[PDB]
């Protein structure tokens, strides 16, 4: 439900500075929709979301010994709020 | 092919129990049961002894170092004890109480 969806947050130089801008970025759930993600974060973060984007990404097929395998493919999502409405739980990172 | 395979993955004894080494170099010695691995049918008695080198591994400890600790064993040179005799000592299974099951020798119990 209004949580399950947000499978993680995104971690990198980029993500961090975007955060600094007031733009937050998570991995999500491939099957999901943008309306669904909006409803999601708007619900579990009490924020005004006015900006959104998503992008499905493959998964670095890697080998560990004679076992060529694909990783699970994710769906990076970016959201921009309004009026400097920074989110608390990640504001320390 | 597993070791408990032909031993119905069955541990005749238990974690705690004193034991005596039947066959081997450690013929007859006492040990509390510190580790009893049923499937592999392996088990640790405070006797055995061993000198192991734990290689470089910088963390923890830059240099290696060594270690006097002890190599496990096969529950088939493990022997339960008889409080009287204390030796090569089979087991019978009887009932004290009151649906509590137990364990005698030819003169119980343990």
């Amino acid at each position: 439900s209004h949580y399950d969806i947000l499978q993680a947050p995104v971690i990198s130089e980029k993500a961090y500075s975007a955060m600094e801008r007031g733009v937050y970025s998570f991995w999500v759930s491939p099957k999901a929709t943008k309306t669904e993600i909006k409803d999601a974060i708007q619900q579990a973060f009490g924020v005004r979301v006015i900006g959104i984007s998503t992008m499905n990404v493959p998964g670095k097929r890697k080998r560990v010994g004679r076992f060529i395998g694909q990783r699970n493919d994710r769906k990076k999502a970016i959201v921009r709020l309004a009026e400097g409405q920074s989110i608390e739980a990640l504001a320390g990172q | 092919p597993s070791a408990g395979s032909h031993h119905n993955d069955k541990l005749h004894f238990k974690k705690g129990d004193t034991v005596i080494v039947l066959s081997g170099k450690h013929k007859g010695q006492t040990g509390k049961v510190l580790l009893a691995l049923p499937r592999d049918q392996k088990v640790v008695v405070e006797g055995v002894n061993v000198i192991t080198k734990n290689v470089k591994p910088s963390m923890t400890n830059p240099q290696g170092g060594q270690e006097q600790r002890e190599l496990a064993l096969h529950a088939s040179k493990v022997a339960l004890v008889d409080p009287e005799t204390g030796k090569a000592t089979r087991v019978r299974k009887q009932i004290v109480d009151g649906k509590k099951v137990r364990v005698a020798v030819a003169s119980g119990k343990t």
């Binding site: 947000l6 947050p9 990640l90 990172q93 | -």
Partner: protein, 66 residues
Amino acid sequence: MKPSEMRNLQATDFAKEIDARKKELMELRFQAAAGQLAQPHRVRQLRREVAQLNTVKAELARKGEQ
């Protein structure tokens, strides 16, 4: 507990009970992939509790219908 603490409680609580169990499970995740998640168990345990909850509301809702 496993039997005595679920069947004593009513399902309109179960909905948001599920909900909160989720929420903590999620924050746990965020932690985990942020590091360090020093108590991995708590995750699987929360899973266990959830499965309990649903098994409960299920068997129950279908046994009250007798």
